[PDB]
Design a protein around this ligand. Structure first.
Ligand SMILES: [Ca+2]
Lengths: 235, 59
C-alpha cells in the first residue's frame, strides 16, 4: 500500500498474509474458520501456500499469529477463461485445521449481492496489506491500510487502455499518491457499515502504483458472493 | 419502506406487509429487541474490531 498508514494490532482481524515460494506475496480475508478469500492471480498453480492470520509485523512475533496450511484452492471457474484479462480475479483457500477465532482472527462480513453493491456505492472503502509501500520499492513489515474513494466507471475506463469489466471497479485518488500495489493482491477492499465491516472488493491489478490519472482495479465482490457462500459452507 | 435511511435497519431491510419493512442481519448477529439494530450473537462475529480499550481510557 502506497501512501497509507500503519494499522494498529487487531484493527483488521480478517486480514491474512499468504506465504509460499515467495514470502508475504499476497493478502486474503477470512471467510470463516476454514476458508480464506483471495485473488485468483495469487494462486495460479505455483507452490504450496501457507496462510498466517493474526499477523501484524512480518519480522516480529506478536504471539497472535495462527499459521495454517492450504489443502484446497478454488479459483473462480471463469478466471483465465480469457488470457491476461484479470477478469474474475478471486479464489478461495481451504485451510487444513480450523482457525481459532479471537480478537485478532475474525471473519469479514459478506452481504448478499444487492447489499454488497449498496455498500460499495457508499463510495469509500479501506484496503490493506503488506505490499509495496512505494512503486518498485520495499514491501511493508507492518500492515498498512488506506481509505480509497470509489471512481466512476467512465473515468475508470478513460484511465487505461486495458479493459475494465463489469466484474471490476476502480478506486483511488484523482491526484494519485495513494493506492494498493504489488504484494497487496487478494487482500480486502472493505466498507464499514456502522461499526461492522463488509467485503466489497478484492485488491486485483493496476498499472504501476499510485500514479496520477491511474486507479487501483478491484474485483467486484458483489458479483461473487453467491459463489463464496456456496463453496465455503461448513459441515 | 426501505427507501429512506434503509428503513432504519442497521444492516439489511426488506419491504413487507404494505409499505412496511423487516430488518435482518448478517450471520453471527441477531435482530435486536427494537427490530432495527443488530447485536452480536456469537463471541467473535464477523466484521468487528474487538481489540479496543487500547490502554488509556475509562471503559
Ligand atoms: Ca508477526
Amino acid at each position: 500500500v502506497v501512501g497509507g498508514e500503519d494499522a494498529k494490532p487487531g484493527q483488521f482481524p480478517w486480514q491474512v498474509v499468504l506465504n509460499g515460494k515467495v514470502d508475504a506475496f499476497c493478502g486474503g480475508s477470512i471467510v470463516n474458520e476454514k476458508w480464506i478469500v483471495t485473488a485468483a492471480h495469487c494462486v495460479e498453480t505455483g507452490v504450496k501456500i501457507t496462510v498466517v492470520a493474526g499477523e501484524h509485523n512480518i519480522e516480529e512475533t506478536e504471539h497472535t499469529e495462527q499459521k495454517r496450511n492450504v489443502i484446497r484452492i478454488i479459483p473462480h471457474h471463469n478466471f483465465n477463461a480469457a488470457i491476461n484479462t484479470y477478469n474474475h480475479d478471486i479464489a478461495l483457500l481451504e485451510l487444513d485445521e480450523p482457525l481459532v477465532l479471537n480478537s485478532y482472527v475474525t471473519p469479514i462480513c459478506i452481504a448478499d449481492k444487492e447489499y454488497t453493491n449498496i455498500f460499495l456505492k457508499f463510495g469509500s472503502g479501506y484496503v490493506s496489506g503488506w505490499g509495496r509501500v512505494f512503486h518498485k520499492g520495499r514491501s511493508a513489515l507492518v500492515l498498512q491500510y488506506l481509505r480509497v474513494p470509489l471512481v466512476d466507471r467512465a473515468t475508470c475506463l478513460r484511465s487505461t487502455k486495458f479493459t475494465i469489466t463489469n466484474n471490476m471497479f476502480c478506486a483511488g485518488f484523482h491526484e494519485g499518491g495513494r493506492d494498493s500495489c504489488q504484494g497487496d493482491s487478494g487482500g480486502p477492499h472493505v466498507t464499514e457499515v456502522e461499526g461492522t465491516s463488509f467485503l466489497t472488493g478484492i485488491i486485483s491489478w493496476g498499472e504501476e502504483c499510485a500514479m496520477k490519472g491511474k486507479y487501483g482495479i478491484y474485483t467486484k465482490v458483489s458479483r461473487y458472493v453467491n459463489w463464496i457462500k456456496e463453496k465455503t459452507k461448513l459441515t | 419502506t426501505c427507501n429512506i435511511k434503509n428503513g432504519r435497519c442497521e444492516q439489511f431491510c426488506k419491504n413487507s406487509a404494505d409499505n412496511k419493512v423487516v430488518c435482518s442481519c448478517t450471520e453471527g448477529y441477531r435482530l435486536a429487541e427494537n427490530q432495527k439494530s443488530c447485536e452480536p450473537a456469537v463471541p467473535f462475529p464477523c466484521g468487528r474490531v474487538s481489540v479496543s480499550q487500547t490502554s488509556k481510557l475509562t471503559r
